[PDB]
Amino acid sequence: KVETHEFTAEISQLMSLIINTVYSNKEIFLRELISNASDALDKIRYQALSDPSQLESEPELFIRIIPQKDQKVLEIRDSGIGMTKADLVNNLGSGTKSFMEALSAGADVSMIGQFGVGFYSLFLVADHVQVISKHNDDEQYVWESNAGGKFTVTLDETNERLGRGTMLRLFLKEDQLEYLEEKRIKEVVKKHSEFVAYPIQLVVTKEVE
Ligand SMILES: CC[C@@H](C)Nc1cc(C(=O)N[C@H]2C[C@H]3CC[C@@H](C2)N3c2ccc(C(=O)C3CC3)cn2)c(C)cc1C(N)=O
């Protein structure tokens, strides 16, 4: 059963801004999303210093990028802490207002991650997103959205089990399909995410002839 919720007004306004801006360095979306993954992996790793059974839901700590060319979808999966349904309905934090203000004063989009709202840079290159997530002691959910208006949260009894962590599915814009290319992904990872302290896997798929 689907639950529908409205974005705060400032989030809808941020989305509309990002999805329509003409920024010439849109590749930074991948850095912002890998930084969120890294942070989520740090959080589970450090909780597990007190309580190592927290890692049992998925013993590997990794980041995994899966272009799906048939679907025009770029997936980014991590085995970090994940998000509770509460994180998914009410959000985490106000970073959103503080970043539109910042843009007003000439701030660069590349600085979105200083304000904790790096997730939304994905709308530089995508017009729809699914967030699949699984937190310890809660269920697996799909959060889904176009850019502005409503988002939905749905109990996930259909998809592959994450074990623990998060998978973003970016539905790429027709002008940004280069982020399905292996060499483009590799060089953007190496340029902006060179010092991430977790392995970054990239899946290349030979599709059936
Ligand atoms: C603890 C996780 C953190 C370290 N990393 C991540 C953070 C995020 C992230 O930003 N999600 C938030 C919460 C959810 C899911 C996407 C988006 C932003 N949503 C919402 C939800 C609600 C609202 C609202 O208007 C409120 C109703 C009024 C706005 N936005 C993500 C997506 C992943 C990771 C990660 N890879 O693990």
Per-position DSSP letters for 6-34, written without gaps between them: EPPHHHHHHHHHHHH---S-TTHHHHHHH
Q: What separation in angstroms does the CA of 144 have from each of 31, 103, 131, 186?
A: 21, 26, 6, 27
Q: Is residue 150 included in any domain, yes or no?
A: yes
Residue 36, annotated as binding a ligand: yes
Q: What's the CA gap between 120 and 112, in Å, rounded? A: 8
Solving technique: X-ray
- Beta strand 63-68 with 200-202: parallel, antiparallel or unpaired? parallel
Q: How many domains does the chain have?
A: 1
- Residues 91, 94, 97, 98: is their CA dihedral positive or negative? negative
DSSP 163: S
Of 76, 120, 78, which is closest to residue 95 (Cα–Cα)? 120
CATH code assigned at 16: 3.30.565.10
* Residue 209, domain member (yes or no): no
In a domain, 208, yes or no: no
Nearest CA to ligand 1 atom 29: 91
8 Å CB contact between 135 and 164: yes
Measured by CA distance, the residue closest to atom 7 of ligand 1 is 36
The alpha carbon of 117 and the centre of ligand 1 are apart by a number of angstroms equal to: 8
Residue 24 lies in a domain: yes
How many other CB atoms are there within 10 angstroms of residue 92's CB atom?
11
Structural domain for 63, as ranges: 2-202
Are the beta carbons of 30 and 118 closer than 8 angstroms?
no
Please give the C-alpha separations between residue 89 and each of 22, 86, 137, in angstroms, as whole numbers.
30, 5, 17
- Identify whether the C-beta of residue 74 lies closer than 8 Å to the C-beta of residue 167: no
74 falls within a domain: yes
CA separation for the pair 67, 75 (Å, rounded): 6
Report the atom number in ligand 1 closest to the C-alpha of 119: 10
Q: Is the dihedral of CA 53, 82, 70, 22 positive or negative?
A: negative
Please tell me the distance between residue 183's alpha carbon and the centre of ligand 1 in angstroms: 29
CA–centroid distance, 208 to ligand 1, in Å, is: 35
3-state secondary structure of 148: coil
Q: Which helix (H) or strand (E) holds 4?
A: strand 2-6
Residue 207, domain member (yes or no): no
Strands 73-78 and 165-172: antiparallel
Find out whether 172 and 74 touch, Cβ atoms under 8 Å.
Answer: yes
Nearest CA to ligand 1 atom 21: 91
What are residue 63's phi and psi, to 5 degrees?
-120, 135
Burial environment of residue 3 by CB neighbours within 10 A (0 to 12, 13 to 18, 19 or more)? middle
